[model samples]
Target: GSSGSSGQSQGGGSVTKKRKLESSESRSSFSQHARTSGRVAVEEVDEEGKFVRLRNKSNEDQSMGNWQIRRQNGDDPLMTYRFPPKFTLKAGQVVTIWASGAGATHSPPTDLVWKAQNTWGCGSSLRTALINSTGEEVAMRKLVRSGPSSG
Candidate 1:
């Protein structure tokens, strides 16, 4: 009877598995904030299309970077100029912008170089609005000339 050739099978024990997890982080920046109206103005313009002087009227220093000037006197083929980056204006101070290869022997650091080939002469009839970073017209030279266009 001891010659019984019986065999038994053994089962393995269960093990716990580990699961790892992670969450992604993100950041979004948009041109949302802009300067209030009348914060900056087109102080001066060379009628001969030579230069421009921007004045900062606020009590705090304002950056002229990415700011714009729009001149659409009477046509859809309007004129515009967006200032270069990092150009800051101290409160109550003026910053000059000379047309590329401008006429006068102007100095730098206190001046800006317009990236324009065909200069748009900003005579009285060509006055433009000062636009903020987000395209809000922050400043304009004159309020109105005559008959109102009110709604």
Candidate 2:
């Protein structure tokens, strides 16, 4: 047992607190993931329901099997023209569907004619809905009369 001079000890060498914000704009840009999809739109319709046009507005093709075009008297439907089982809309392509009495030949590549004669409501104000295979309404258009009170 030995005891010797227990007073005045050296202390405080260095206690450096190292702290930093690790998220300093490190993951600011997602540069490793990318995806995009195309869409179709109901672009044009004739005055007396002669023809309707649909166009794909992107650079990618779209599958349109069972896609439907519905003619309605402002709501619901009068007729539905379902697309062919293997119909695929090409990128940036415009395809037309003619009415029965439209007097246009059904071209194989880009034209189709509905069996229903002038399916649109005869001048009583009507609309159309473009529906996809899953019954989702993709686009819509209205051919409203030019009567006043549009305000």
Candidate 3:
């Protein structure tokens, strides 16, 4: 977990609690760390229209291989899985997800709907933040966006 501290507002108003963006990654297993940053919260939506709070079961980051999904034809490019997924955020917080990604190009658009669980079923939608794009730079750095819900 990250630490929070008091800071001055832009207008010099009363001190406000400031939260630092903290992140963790895993190399051995396809998983992620459960986070409850007070600054924000997220929600998980599934293809079944089931929406629930995102929970983190494993503190491992999701390696690219574990997230890729294949079609019946098997002719599609070996793209990483990106749908029916979880959103990351603090508990009691809500975020209407817009998009999720693995590498770049937004192969999977942000507006694409997903389920509430990852293939491994490790966390809720709110536990897994998305990169919106799987571009080389985004995946190399493992960038995730945490903000208010757009939907």
Candidate 4:
């Protein structure tokens, strides 16, 4: 979250604050109408493990598309063409991801990434999903503490 604020330093007489954006327990939702055109879209996994539905916003069927997650281990990743395309969760929380489609493409679950860039492109490693259809549903958690120029 990166608050980008400053504070007073305890050591010496210097005024400094730590600029760290840590996320906490928060909840949100993302949804869209069916699309007329087919393209890639994204959603989130909630704590309850519900799919955050997304649509084409234009209310067109073809406008909507499907999505999948390829694993780094070199196997068929999961697909969400039939099942819900997204999951839900609280900030800093963890959840399992699954995709469903025809054949073995939509089977099995893959390790989910947190706060990843949502898009597809060169240097985009396919690891990051499309952000336009994706978003963070909760706040983030900070495990360590730090100070300006120090920890």
Candidate with top lDDT is: 2
In order, candidate lDDTs are: 0.63, 0.70, 0.29, 0.27
- Residues 1-151 of candidate 1: C-alpha lDDT, one tens digit per residue: 3666788999989757656656565632221122336767677655445677777788899887787876554333576787668777789988777777576544665776766644555333345567778778887643222334559
lDDT of 4 by residue, 98-143 (tens): 2221111222222332223221111111222223233321111111
Full ranking by TM-score: 2, 1, 4, 3
**Per-residue lDDT of 25-97 in model 3, one digit per residue for the tens?**
5443222233333222223423211222233222443233222221111222222334344523233433232
Question: What RMSD does model 2 have?
Answer: 16.9
Global lDDT for candidate 1? 0.63
Off by over 4 Å in 4: 1-44, 47-52, 63-151
Off by over 4 Å in 2: 1-38, 74-77, 116-118, 148-151
Clashes (backbone N, CA, C under 3 Å), per candidate, total 0, 0, 22, 34
Where model 1 places Cα greater than 4 Å from the true spot, the runs are 1-36, 73-76, 122-124, 142-151
- Per TM-score, the best of the predicted structures is 2
Using all chains and alpha carbons, the TM-scores for the candidates as numbered come to 0.58, 0.66, 0.17, 0.20
Window of ten residues with lowest summed lDDT in model 1 = 27-36
lDDT of 2 by residue, 1-151 (tens): 9878757767667756666636455432212121112288876766467787888886788889888877775444477778887999898998998877787678745887776555444453666778888777777766656545646
